[PDB]
Amino acid sequence: KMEELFKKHKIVAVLRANSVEEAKKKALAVFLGGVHLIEITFTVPDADTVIKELSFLKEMGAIIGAGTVTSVEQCRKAVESGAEFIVSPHLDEEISQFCKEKGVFYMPGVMTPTELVKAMKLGHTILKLFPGEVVGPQFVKAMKGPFPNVKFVPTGGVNLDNVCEWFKAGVLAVGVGSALVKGTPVEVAEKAKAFVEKIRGC
Amino acid sequence: KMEELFKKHKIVAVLRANSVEEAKKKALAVFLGGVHLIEITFTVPDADTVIKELSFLKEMGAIIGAGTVTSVEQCRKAVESGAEFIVSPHLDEEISQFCKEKGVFYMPGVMTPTELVKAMKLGHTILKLFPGEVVGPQFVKAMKGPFPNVKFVPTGGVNLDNVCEWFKAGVLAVGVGSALVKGTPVEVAEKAKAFVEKIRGC
Amino acid sequence: KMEELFKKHKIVAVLRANSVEEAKKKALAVFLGGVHLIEITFTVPDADTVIKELSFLKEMGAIIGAGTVTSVEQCRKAVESGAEFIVSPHLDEEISQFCKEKGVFYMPGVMTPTELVKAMKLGHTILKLFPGEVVGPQFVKAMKGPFPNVKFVPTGGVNLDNVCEWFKAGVLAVGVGSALVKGTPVEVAEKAKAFVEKIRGC
Amino acid sequence: KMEELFKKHKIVAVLRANSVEEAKKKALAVFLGGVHLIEITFTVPDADTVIKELSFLKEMGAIIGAGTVTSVEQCRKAVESGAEFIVSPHLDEEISQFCKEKGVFYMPGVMTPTELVKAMKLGHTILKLFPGEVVGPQFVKAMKGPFPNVKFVPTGGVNLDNVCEWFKAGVLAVGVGSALVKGTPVEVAEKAKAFVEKIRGC
């Protein structure tokens, strides 16, 4: 199901913000603009509370998860507050195990073939590729040779000009942060619309 | 307090929509764009439910009321569901009385000097002027002579080109429907921003 | 049935005249030119007699009513003489009640949202909008928002150049006086033809 | 007699002012410039006193009345202080009744056919049309059809450029406020002269 949602929606908003209020307003902006997968990063103050207060959007079909999860303690709080998926920038064995026992989808970040293989050995085949702006579509195309059955969701630098190249390389979905989320609510809702159209357009 | 909120915010979104979902999305759009006074009209299907489901926005400082209230039964449902103010297109003695006993702010609509005077005799000095596009700023300026202490909130045709003329005529706030609310969520949030700036700009 | 006739014919001749003879000749002119709904106003001398003497045109499918009805005494005479519908420039509670008991269609005139609402509370949803030249199509479009289920028949200034705008605004039918009825019998019969064609043409 | 005075003089100065002294000086200015019908509005501070202190001008043929009368208490004070006629912006049943018992001419304001008819049912055939700038000569011409025996005295926006159009539409007299009364005493006396000449000129 987690796989199937990424496949269908193709875009996850990676939401960094300086306050609970800003984070909630941007999550609403993004949703109102057609982005259903919303990742509340743990760099948001009280990211816990934000996920809990957005829980009602689930009734409107939003899928609210947590990102920048770097300890099992953070993972527990996110899940306790209703996170439907966990994302980290790195591969965390302890978070992998906790999410396995808890029955919650975890997408670890990876940057190398060795990291990729370790993640596969922990049962993962959908991987966050981070930072995408460093490793690029080139990396995604290179992995298709030896690891035809791994799929990536790049985060980092994905924007309006390159989103289609990423999909050409073979990515499953993209995670979009500052290109989507930075600005005012109005600007964010609008940029949300543009990304959906640009993605549909390819 | 009701007076003071109109005075401070200067704009009320008059929200007509074909569904609960559309109405809620537009109310969020408008709020995200800086409009704090939100009038859910009773032409919205299940307008009751929409007001109740937006009740949480009150915690973010939104002021949610009901419009197009044409019977005391509708008035009761709106108040029961958390409406902070009641608006009608016409002057309704029965709704006036109910709102007086219930202690809820009622803004009846008026179009003539005789209607105005009847409303004043029922204790009202803040009046909806409807339809504003028929009677215009001219009407507001004409009323200043004989009725210096009446203040109007015009609804009907208020838009980006004429909003400043209305404020020049002496209105207390404006109620904006289709110029603000029509379109998609993204377009509405954006038009919301434009109205706030244009109003500040005068 | 009354609703359905307005809907089908779309035009009511509002017949003012200085004599019984002039009124009858103009009603025949109009009918001969394709206008089936004929409103004999009570400003016609012996308007009573005119309605009675046109009673035979009912056998040819004419629908003869009375207009400018301002008292229940006038209403009684019109109904007694065979009026199939009653029209007034204003909203009259006493005429509303009499027509309700008598089982005759009454179309009160209204000019404001408050008047409109009072008429609805008296059971009316088809309203004469008068004077149309003051309030315009703009008023009809403005009412669609809050009162989607009210339909108007404007009287006042409707002519060959604006009849289609009125229908664009959402009116149910139009009442046409001087643009149709003024002139000689021959000119009236001809103008009747032009209005039917112009209305069909939109 | 009240009718006959309006008919003869054709213009009533509608006098708004910020003080007793300003109001008296403007009433003298206007009279000195040929305007015999003077309406002291109740928005003038101590409008009561102004009417009483102008009582002597009655000996010079001035006709001093009261305007912007909105309660029976105000009506009583005006009559007690020598008002020869009462004007209101709206139709007031309570003021109608009081003026009927007291034997003083009352001219209610009306804006719609329904208001007009109610006023006629209360015994009035000379009506203030207010606000004239909203409803225009068009409204006066429209009323001639159904209500040939009603006569209007428009107040609101009447000026040097449009006064003759109003008389062309069929008005009985005009009520002129700011176009006549605003400015200094000298300017007012002069504008008074211009209106009389312009009216005579049509």
Q: Resolution of the deposited coordinates, in angstroms?
A: 5.7
Q: How many contacts, defined by CB atoms under 8 Å, are there between A and B?
A: 39
**Which residue matches tokens 């989103």?**
A163
Best D112, D149, D152 member to test C by mutation, with max C CBs in 10 Å, is: D112
* A190 contacts in chain B (CB < 8 Å): 186, 189-190
Q: What DSSP state is assigned to residue C39?
A: E
B-contacting chains (≥3 CB pairs under 8 Å)? A, C, D
- Taking any CB pair shorter than 8 Å as contact, residues of chain D touching chain C are 111-118, 120, 134-136, 138-139, 142-143, 145-148
* C-alpha–C-alpha distance, residues A154 and A171, integer Å: 7
Q: Residue B115 and residue C117: Cβ atoms within 8 Å?
A: no
Please pick, among C10, C26, C77, C128, the residue that the annotation labels catalytic: C128
Best B112, B122, B124 member to test D by mutation, with max D CBs in 10 Å, is: B112
Q: How many residues does chain D have?
A: 202
Query: Which residues of A carry out catalysis?
Result: 39, 128
* C-alpha–C-alpha distance, residues A115 and C118, integer Å: 75
In whole angstroms, how far apart are CA A33 and each of A36, A180, B26?
9, 10, 12
CB of D189 closer than 8 Å to CB of D29: yes
**Which of D118, D120, D146 is opposite residue C68, by nearest beta carbon?**
D146
* C-alpha–C-alpha distance, residues A174 and A199, integer Å: 10
Vertex A18: Cα angle to A132 and B60 (nearest 5):
125
The answer on whether B16 is annotated among ligand-binding residues is yes
Q: Residue C43 and residue D139: Cβ atoms within 8 Å?
A: no
Secondary structure string (H, E, C) spanning chain B: CHHHHHHHHCEEEEECCCCHHHHHHHHHHHHHCCCCEEEEECCCCCHHHHHHHHHHHHHHCCEEEEECCCCHHHHHHHHHCCCCEEECCCCCHHHHHHHHHHCCEEECEECCHHHHHHHHHCCCCEEEECCHHHHHHHHHHHHHCCCCCCEEEEECCCCCCCHHHHHHHCCCCEEECHHHHCCCHHHHHHHHHHHHHHHHCC
In whole angstroms, how far apart are CA D13 and each of C47, D29, D41, D64, D67?
41, 11, 10, 10, 10
Q: What DSSP state is assigned to residue A59?
A: G
A115 exposed, middle or buried (CB, 10 Å; 0-12, 13-18, 19+)? middle
Q: How many CB atoms lie within 10 A of CB C197?
A: 12
CB of C116 closer than 8 Å to CB of C152: no
Distance of CA B95 to the CA centre of its chain: 16
Q: How many helices (H) and strands (E) does chain D have?
A: 10, 9
H-helix segments, A33-131: 47-54, 72-80, 93-102, 113-121
CA of B189 vs chain A CAs: smallest distance (Å): 6
The token pair at B120 is 């004043």
Residue of chain D whose alpha carbon sits nearest to that of C91: D114
* C-alpha–C-alpha distance, residues D180 and A14, integer Å: 67
CB of C64 closer than 8 Å to CB of C84: yes
Please pick, among C22, C39, C53, C84, the residue that the annotation labels catalytic: C39
Residue of chain B whose alpha carbon sits nearest to that of D108: B114
Residue of chain B whose alpha carbon sits nearest to that of C143: B131
Q: What is the sign, positive or negative, of the torsion defined by CA atoms of A44, A47, A53, A59?
A: positive
Dmax over CA atoms of chain B, in Å, equals 45
* C-alpha–C-alpha distance, residues C143 and C150, integer Å: 8
**Which residue matches tokens 């909130």?**
B153
Active site residue C128: yes
Q: What DSSP state is assigned to residue A82?
A: T
CA-closest candidate to residue C89, choices D139, D113, D135: D113
Vertex C129: Cα angle to C127 and C135 (nearest 5):
150
* C-alpha–C-alpha distance, residues A182 and A120, integer Å: 33
CA of B157 vs chain C CAs: smallest distance (Å): 8
CB of B169 closer than 8 Å to CB of B140: yes
Buried b (16+ CB within 10 A) or exposed e, C122-161: bebebbbbbbbbbbbbbbbbbbbbbbeebbbbbbbbbbee
Q: Residue A32 and residue B33: Cβ atoms within 8 Å?
A: no
The answer on whether A52 is annotated among ligand-binding residues is no
* C-alpha–C-alpha distance, residues D49 and D56, integer Å: 13
CA-closest candidate to residue A24, choices A2, A48, A3: A48
Method: cryo-EM
Type and span of the H or E element at D64: strand D63-67
C-contacting chains (≥3 CB pairs under 8 Å)? B, D
Best B69, B134, B155, B162 member to test C by mutation, with max C CBs in 10 Å, is: B134
* C-alpha–C-alpha distance, residues D126 and D109, integer Å: 10
* C108 contacts in chain D (CB < 8 Å): 114
Q: How many CB atoms lie within 10 A of CB A117?
A: 14
Q: Is D119 helix (H, G, I), strand (E, B) or coil?
A: helix
The token pair at C70 is 């301002």
* C-alpha–C-alpha distance, residues C87 and C67, integer Å: 4
Q: How many CB atoms lie within 10 A of CB C201?
A: 8
CB of C192 closer than 8 Å to CB of C36: no
Residue of chain A whose alpha carbon sits nearest to that of B20: A60
